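Input (Hydrocephalus-inducing protein homolog):
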Amino acid sequence: GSSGSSGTEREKFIVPIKARGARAILDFPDKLNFSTCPVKYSTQKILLVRNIGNKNAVFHIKTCRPFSIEPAIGTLNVGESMQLEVEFEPQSVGDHSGRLIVCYDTGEKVFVSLYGAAIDMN
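Output:
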C-alpha cells in the first residue's frame, strides 16, 4: 500500500474550467532526436526556447552523464528567446534513450525523451 505503485501511463494534464492570475510556461519539444552520431566522440545540439507564459518563468533541468546539458537552469522573460546546449556522449555503442525532467519554481514538471543512436563507425 504505502509503498508500491503498479504503474499508469502519463496523461497530459489539463487546466480547470477557468484559471487566471500569473503563470509561467515555456516551449519545449516532445523529445530530442540525435541523428547518427559517433559512440566515442561526444555529441551536442542547440535548443531554442521562447517564453510563452505571462510572467518570468524559472525552469531547472536535472540530468547526468552520459546525458548532460547547460545551463542546467535559467530564467527567460516573456517576449524573448534563448539557446540551450545539450551535451551527450554515448560511451557505449547502441541506442540510448532518456528523459529530461524539468523543475519549475511554481511546482511543475516536464518530460522530454532523449535519443542518440551511437555507432562503432570509429
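The chain is about 0% helix and 35% strand.
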